[PDB]
Every structure is written in C-alpha cells, then in structure tokens.
Amino acid sequence: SKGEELFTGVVPILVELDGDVNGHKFSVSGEGEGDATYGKLTLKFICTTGKLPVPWPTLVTTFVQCFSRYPDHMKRHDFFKSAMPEGYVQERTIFFKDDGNYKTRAEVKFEGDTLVNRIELKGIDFKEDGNILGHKLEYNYNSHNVYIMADKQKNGIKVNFKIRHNIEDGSVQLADHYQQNTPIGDGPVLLPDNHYLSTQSALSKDPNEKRDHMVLLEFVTAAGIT
Amino acid sequence: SDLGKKLLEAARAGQDDEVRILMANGADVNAADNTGTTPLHLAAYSGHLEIVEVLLKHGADVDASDVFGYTPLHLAAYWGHLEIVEVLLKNGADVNAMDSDGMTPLHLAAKWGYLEIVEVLLKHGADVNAQDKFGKTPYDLATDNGNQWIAELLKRAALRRKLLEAARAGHRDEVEDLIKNGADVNAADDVGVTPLHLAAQRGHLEIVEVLLKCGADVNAADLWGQTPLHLAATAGHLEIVEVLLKNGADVNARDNIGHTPLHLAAWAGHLEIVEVLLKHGADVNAQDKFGKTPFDLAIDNGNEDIAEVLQKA
Amino acid sequence: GNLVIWINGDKGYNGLAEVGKKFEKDTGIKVTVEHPDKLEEKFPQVAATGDGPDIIFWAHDRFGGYAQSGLLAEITPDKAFQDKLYPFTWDAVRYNGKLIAYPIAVEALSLIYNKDLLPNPPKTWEEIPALDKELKAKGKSALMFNLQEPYFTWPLIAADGGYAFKYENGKYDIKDVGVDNAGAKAGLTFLVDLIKNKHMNADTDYSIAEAAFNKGETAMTINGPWAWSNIDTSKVNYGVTVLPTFKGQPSKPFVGVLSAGINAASPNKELAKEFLENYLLTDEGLEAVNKDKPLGAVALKSYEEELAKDPRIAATMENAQKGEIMPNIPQMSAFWYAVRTAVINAASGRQTVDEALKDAQTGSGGTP
C-alpha cells in the first residue's frame, strides 16, 4: 500500500489560503511540520494581508487530515494517505448557527517533499453584530469527533461533524461542517467503512511575532474499528 | 520594443496610474533593455511599492538577473526599501541570489547596516555563510564597513543555524566545536526549538549530554509548550528520558494542550519510559486540557499493557 | 627675415598677434599669426624638407610624433629661465631625455559641483554612494560625468596606482603597461559598482552629463576647463575643487600641456628663441593672449599666482600637480582603444572587470 510510506516520519507542511468574507478580502500563510505516526501537527499561521476579518479559530478546520493517526488495524480505512502523492480535493460548507456560512475548496497534495493545502474560501451572510465579525469567539479550541463515511457515488468520502466555538459570554457557536472529499488521482483508493476521528487542538500566540498569527498544536487519532 | 521602453520608463517615474493602462494593453512584464533591467528592477531601486504589487500580480520574474546578476531583491535590500523586500520575498524571491561577484542581498544590507532589512532577510533563510568574490561573508562586510553590531548579529545567526543543523544531523564533534566558538546553546529559532529539542527528538544521545553541561535549559518551551522530555517520550528514546530527568527536567511539564511527558509516552506505546516517568514522580492522575489522563490515552490507542501499569496508580 | 606662426582657431590668435606685432616693432621681423585647419596633421609632411612655420603651438602629445622624425628643433633654456616655470611642465616637452618645446598652459579635469544642491563637496570617492541616496531623496543624482571616453574616467582608475606607461627621466617603457595592476582594478571596480548600484548609468556620455549638471539635475560632474563657458551660460552656481581621493591617493587625471615647438628648418631660430623666452612667457605677454582667449592654468608661476586668485584656475592647477602627464609616444593610440573597450564592457556588464582589464592590458601591448 504505497502512499502511506510517505507519512512514516516527520513531513513539512505549507498552508496558503486566499478567502473572502463579506468582501473582507484576506490571505493567510501557515508553516510547520506534521507527524502522522502520532497524529501530531506542529504549525503556525500568519495573516499576510494584515488583520483577519474573522477570528482565527473559525478557520482551524479549513487550515490536512492525512496526518491523523490510524491504528495499524485501520490502515485499510486510511483514505487520505492512500490518495497521496496525487492528493485529494476537500470541499466544505460550514454552517454557523444563526450566522453566515463558509464554502471552501482545497487541494491537499504533495508538492515536492512537503505537503501543501491550497485553499479557497468564501463566507456570506455574516451579521456585523454576529460572533464572527464581532470577534466574540474565545482564542481556544475544543475536542471533537470527525465522523467519516463512504460515498459510493463520488468515489470518495463524506464527513460531517459539529464544532463548538467558545464565546466570551459563555455560550457556544456551532459550525456544522458538511465535508466531501474526492481523489485527484485516477487510480485505486481504499474507501473506508464508517468510522470517526478524535481531535485535540490548542491555540497559542508567538510572543516574538507582531503579525496577526495563530500557533496550533493538534493531535488526531482514528477509531471505531477493531 | 517601444511598449517595453514605456513600461521601464513608467516604472522609474512611479506613475502608478500609467502602468495599469499599460498592463491592460498586454505589455510584456519581463521586458528587459540592453542591461537586462526589467520594470521590476527599477521599481525596487526607485522605491515604488504599489507598482511592485501590480507587476507581481501580472507574473513578473521576481528572480530576473540583469547583466551583472543583480535581482530585484538586491536593489530593494540595498536601497533600504523594507516594504519592497518584504513583498518580494513573499512572492518567492531568491533570498540567496548572487551577482557576478557572488554578493547576496545580505552582503549589501550588511554593508549599509540596514538592521530591519537584515532581520527580514535572516528570517527568510539568508545564507550568512555565503562568500563573495573577495572571500568575505556579510559578517566581514559588516565589520569593514563599520557596522559591528550587525556583525555580531550576523555571527550569532550563523552559529545558531549551524548549531541546530548540527544537532538535527547528529554530529557530536561539530557541536562540541561550535560551542568553543561562542555558539549559544540556548539559541532558539523562529520555532522556539533549541539544539536540545532536536538532539532529544532525533535520538542522538551523546549530543544531548554535551548541550546539557553547557547550560542548556532542559525545560525550554517551544511555541507549542513542548519540552525535550515531551519530544523524547513521543519518539521513545529511553536513555534520553533518563538523562533529561537527571538534569532537572520537569517530569510534569505541560504543552499547550496540557499533555505531560506521561500522556505522550502512553500515546506512542513506550512502556519502559512510562516506568521511568513514574519512578521520577509523574502524576498519573494529571489530565490534559480536555480531562484525559494518560490512562485514558492508553486504552484509546489499544495498548493496555500501558493501562495495566497505569491501573496501578 | 620672416616669422610664420600657426595656432588653432579656438585659441587666442588675436592676442598673440599683438605680442607678435609688438615684436615686429623691436626687431623689424614680420610676425604672421595664422590659424589654419588641420595644422597638426599637415605640419609633419609639409615642413620636413620644405618651408614651414618657424614656431608651432599644440598639445605635447603630438610633439612625440614630430620629435620621432626630428622635425622640431632642440631648444636649450638657461637654468635661470627653467626656474620661472613649474618643474613638472618640462616633463611634458621632455622626449628621450631632451626638451622640445616651451610649456604654456596646463589643462586637467577637476571636480565641478553645484554649491546650491551641495555646499560642501565630498573629499573622498567613498562618500558618493552615501551622498547619492541623500540627494536621490530629492530626485537629484550626486555625480554624473562622461563614461564613454576613458580620458574622463581614468583619474579614478589610476588613483590607486594605475599608469599607462612608466615615465622615467623622459622615457616611457613601452613594454611595461599598467592597466592590469590592483590599483586600476580596485579603482574601476568602484566605478562599475556605481553603475551596478544604479548610482550612474553605463550609457552616460559627455552631453547628458553636461546637460544634467547644467540643468541642475545632478549636483556634481567631472570636466575640464573647456566646459566653464557653457556652465556660466547655464547660470548654475558652480564651483571647482580638487578631485576626491580614493584609497588615500589623489585622482590622477591625464594632463595636457599646450607647448610651443620650434621648426627644425627655420632660417631664424635664435631670434625666434628670444621671442618666446623674453616676450611671450611674461606677465604682460601672457596677459595679452589671455584677454583674447583664456588659457586656464599657466606654466609660468608669476602669472599663475595672479590667476590663482580665481579658485577655478587654481583648482585645475592642484589636479595637474597631482595628475599624470599624458605620454607623447604614439603607442597611446592603442592605449585609448584598448582601455575604451574595457570600460564600456565592464560598465555594460558585457565582461567582468578582471577579464576586461587583462584584455586591455594585452591590447595596450603589456604583460600581466
């Protein structure tokens, strides 16, 4: 099963996103490395256009599930690494409770030795008093379950999960992620049986960084099969 | 051609509005005159920011070399146009391009001592060790031209980058040598990583020993709260775990997520480390930011031989 | 008894006639002051074995060719007269250890700057790059001068030790050429840098340099005494000072000494020797010709100190004393071509400095 031998060790990661939210054009660049052996991502993100019109946490999902740790008995269900180096397309339609919605396309593929996640984004119908444009979300992230399922029609997987964005007042903003991945390569890919991924993320700030940035440590593991 | 000359002239003049009309006319963006100078070269030396932004949007060769080998980054760094340098590098400018005399943009910035430009060049990976035609590094030009501070800063940036690359590769003899030559053992890159972080993660025992005796902060924290003990647990280097613990490594240090080195040792499946951690007083009851003990992580990964020893509490 | 004298039109021939006409009044020998075209190339062939002018006026660089054929008479002034003139002036008329002519005036490039844009000019070449940014801030350049001809650029190349042909006791070693030494390299490299650094432009020539400084677009330039009449017409509050020093050494521009040679086939030579010695080379004699057309810096000290009142002239004299005499041997013709191609290629990046200089060293008949 070639394509997984590329994630045996540490792999550098580059992330470039160019998006639009209510006309607030912006672009962001993240760098780092990820270790699929432990589902570990060691990344840092920098907004190149100055300030972000939306809070950093709202984009954590959009900013490489191939690094998610797969137990040796679920390697048959590792759709991400089986799609490499050709890569896979990632399309999401995130619904923010009582607010607008992002709509993303991204190509997670290998460019040289490193893995890149080129992303397009468009957010619409966000209220200026909303929790997004109001920067009312806390600078933190929760743990979630990413439920993967197979879509026989698209020759790819379907993924659905809700994400809890903490609010400063104490409430919660939910973001319904309706995700659809398809492979770029015209070859064989192992479509998995229904299961889920468990995510852990923590957000920090570089004290020696003046630009609008986000430091993220993320751990992910796959489960649901014996 | 004529339209070529118009764009070169418009770039030197700085008429932002005249260029846009010229671009809509399909004017060759990489057009070069006799000297090989392109509209992007002139805008950089002149200092026009808005023109550079548009020229790059239209696919201007950011690494174009004139007859002398100079590139747009040479001039922008030379003439002290920080905003120009920052944007040029963002669009993939060769940070170590060399002219016919082997002079990088760092050589030029060190001559004139533009600190703010040297910092951005170093941050983007400038080869401080690069040698010009005359056997002079940018550090040599900083001293001859009288900028002794940037010389020290250039010297420092050289040793840390050399030192981290010495630990990551695993060359013991070199690490010992660099420290003799003033290499800061507590030197940290943009990532917060120190030579000890890499010596532990990579698994070079002898290097870890050396760094520690030279005052290496064993509890050094990168931007994700990770400590060489965290990295040694995830990787599974038993000897390294014992060494760090003997030199005062905080056995309950927490990364940004809240994982101790015990959480991580239970994550990867390194039993022998779990014992040493507990032997040195690892809080088995400790939980991460999400209330997960190292036990909960052991059962989730399906390595109960760990949970069994954690069941002992 | 006749005296036929030739001199170029742009030089003062009206005032020379006054001195000649005054000489007619004391000796009864007619003095014809004529200014015909092509007097330099026509003299060696017309008067070799025929009737020619008894005295001739022209830069010393040509007397090397005239002396090679021996068409100019050997002149011997007494020690009392030799001391009236500056010592270095005789070296221009010195050929094979022998003297050929009387030096009259001296010309050499000097630093011309705009006092308005820059009251205190730079004393060292190393100051221009820093000064250029300070002036480029206001849309004006610091230095701008002719780069196509080596005669204008040479003072910087030769500053640190460069030399065309070693001059020893009136004789040049033709085998030894000095356009490859470190001094020329160290110098020219700095010149190329200024172009490489966008401080100057390789295509810069005489006209735009004059126009730029005359229009106030640039604050400095390098030129000879001949461009003064055009600057004062431009009304730029200009000045003249010593050329800046590079590597501690003073810039070495080539010096052109207008000299007066005596024809070998002249029926009256002793009486003609007296005219130049006792009548032309005096305060009143040189003053007469100076009123017609200015000669700039002069060889005779008593009249130079009177002209030293003008710093523009005294400035030219300062460079001349520090500069190098222009060799009069004919091999210079190949020196100009070989050196011209070197600066043009190194300035346009067509060839590296070392490659350009070594190709010029051989091109001038030298050994590296």
Numbering used by the authors:
A (entry chain C): 2 to 64, 68 to 230
B (entry chain A): 12 to 324
C (entry chain B): 5 to 372
Per the authors:
In this paper, we present a strategy to fuse specific, high-affinity protein binders to obtain multivalent or multispecific scaffolds of predetermined geometry. DARPins are used as building blocks to confer the desired specificity to the construct. A series of rigid connector modules replacing the DARPin capping repeats allow to combine the individual DARPin domains in such a way that their distance and angle can be altered to test different geometries, bringing the binding partners of the DARPins into a defined spatial arrangement. The two helices are not just joined end-to-end, but instead the two domains are made to overlap in such a way that the joining helix is stabilized by contacts with the domain cores along its entire length.
All 9 off7_Hxx_3G124 constructs were able to bind MBP and GFP simultaneously, demonstrating the absence of steric hindrance between the two targets, consistent with the structural models. Two DD constructs yielded crystals of the ternary complex: off7:MBP_H10_3G124:GFP crystallized in space group C2 (3.1 Å resolution, 3 complexes/ asymmetric unit (a.u.)) and off7:MBP_H11_3G124:GFP in space group P21212 (3.0 Å resolution). All three components of the complexes were well-resolved in the electron density maps. The structures of off7:MBP_H10_3G124:GFP and off7:MBP_H11_3G124:GFP confirm that DD fusions are capable of crystallizing with two target proteins bound simultaneously. In the complexes, the interactions between DARPins and target proteins were found to be very similar to the interactions seen in the absence of fusion partners. This is an important observation, as this reassures that any conclusions derived from complexes of DD and DDD fusions will also be valid for individual DARPins.
